[model samples]
Target: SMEEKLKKTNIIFVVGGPGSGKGTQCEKIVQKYGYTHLSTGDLLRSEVSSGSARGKKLSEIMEKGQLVPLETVLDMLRDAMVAKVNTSKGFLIDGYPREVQQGEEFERRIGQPTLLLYVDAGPETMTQRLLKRGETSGRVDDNEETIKKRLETYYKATEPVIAFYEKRGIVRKVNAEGSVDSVFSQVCTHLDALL
Candidate 1:
């Protein structure tokens, strides 16, 4: 059944450091391409609010700025994707596969992604954006200390995942420091080719 589902489900990973505009650009892609958007953070936060045992575990992990177990994250993604597979043409899985091992495990379990879209932005820009966003963003992790830690984690863990996909020729890098429309234009160039 998993194999059969994989044959029909098209997955694209949207990855970038926090405040790199990946989430903003993903909304544009969804509007244009009609793909389902699944943000791992959003899913995990939902679980945290669900008041279940798994939610309790997820809450504790997130509170300490640590990653949830890879298998648990994948299990959540699998459940969400399966529910939408028939109605949705594809998925833009945002903020996932934060490490090489996670990416490899995802492929082993769910099949390879159609693409790994990396939104490129420097840490300085990301820091500035997150600081500005924190004024009203209401996220506990939006503060400078947490943002710094998150960026450090991104560089250490997520960068290798991007490289792993690059070796497979499935990684598309889009400059994300530009204006939203400009960044989306570049993103469109890569996505248009795929569609």
Candidate 2:
């Protein structure tokens, strides 16, 4: 009889500005390595669609063109992690911990993510990508003013979260300003070592 090695669930947090190619690389990571992909945006959208209490709150916020609270985002992440804890395959969570407090709350709830990936791309690159995506995305938040606000929000609220992981030695900075395949290779290289 073969001895079974205990399978530990790994959670990776993929952080990046809008249009930084985080989603593209995350898809590649999932397809190649079987890590489940969870996007915070998708979760919030689902909540809005489901008509749950949280969903109602999210819808109200969106209806007012306001941002959701940090705690709500943390709750969604906590639920996702708890739901997947028993699986042998791990998870790749994207677009989370938009604030330092949220990162701290996440640590309190789910411990630290096994790895933090910072997909770094220039503002120009991000702007171009967003402009190109406008037609297909149809995301009201992707408009120029909102896009700039989102970028500013990322720098003001989210950059510290990356610094937190960087200081902990679990962060990998990937240059996300290139062809999709090239940028994805960088992400893969980082995951190859951790997985």
Candidate 3:
């Protein structure tokens, strides 16, 4: 008795370079919008244990120290999205559309995004955040050298996809260099316009 049958789906694709703010804002968006939040990394990771044929291949690749292909990821995530399409308010898909090519394929399988939330922050800001985290946590990829490489890789691949959505006029760029409340405030205005 707790479900609502929605006539349409709002696929909000979240693209962020690197940091904790993006994850925090996504949690905020879910609370406010009552949307189902699905992270692409989680989707892929779980599917590998799903006992399906596709999952088998993904599992094999994982043991070989490789990455799952994007098309495979889209198909897996599309199924996940479809499973809840009947009742969920909308989908807050995180960490996707890193390339325009996948975005195109996503349109072919799943529907086009209702909104693209681009958590915009400069490279300096992002690097500092990660470097600070690395210092205390001593985690892999936290050093300045690795942080720069990862940031640039993300920017090079993701900027094109962001530009692609810009043409369609669904990109909402939020300045995420400030405090959490201040940043989520900007997100509220952009999401509020959708209704």
Candidate 2 lDDT by residue in tens digits, 1-195: 000111246768899887888778888888899888888888888777786886777766654435588877877776776666556387787988777788787767666678888999888899889878986875555667767877777788788988888888999999988788988788888888876
Per residue, candidate 3 scores C-alpha lDDT tens digits across 12-111 of: 9899886636778989988888989888766766776578897777766544433368877777777777788777888888877767888898877666
Better of 1 and 2 by lDDT: 1
> Which 10 consecutive residues of model 3 have the lowest summed lDDT?
1-10
Best by TM-score: 1
Listed in order, each prediction's TM-score against the native is 0.93, 0.86, 0.80
Best-to-worst order by TM-score is 1, 2, 3
lDDT for predicted candidate 1 compared with the true structure: 0.86
lDDT of 3 at 91: 83
Which ranking of candidates, highest lDDT first?
A: 1, 2, 3
Off by over 4 Å in 2: 1-8, 50-67
Query: Which lDDT tens digits does candidate 1 get at residues 1-195?
Result: 756776677789999998999889989989999999999899999887789998888877765667789888988988888888878878899999898898888878778888889899999999999899989776667877778778878888988888788888988889888799999989999988888
Model 1 residue runs over 4 Å out of place are: 51-56
Best candidate according to lDDT: 1
The lDDT of each candidate is 0.86, 0.77, 0.76
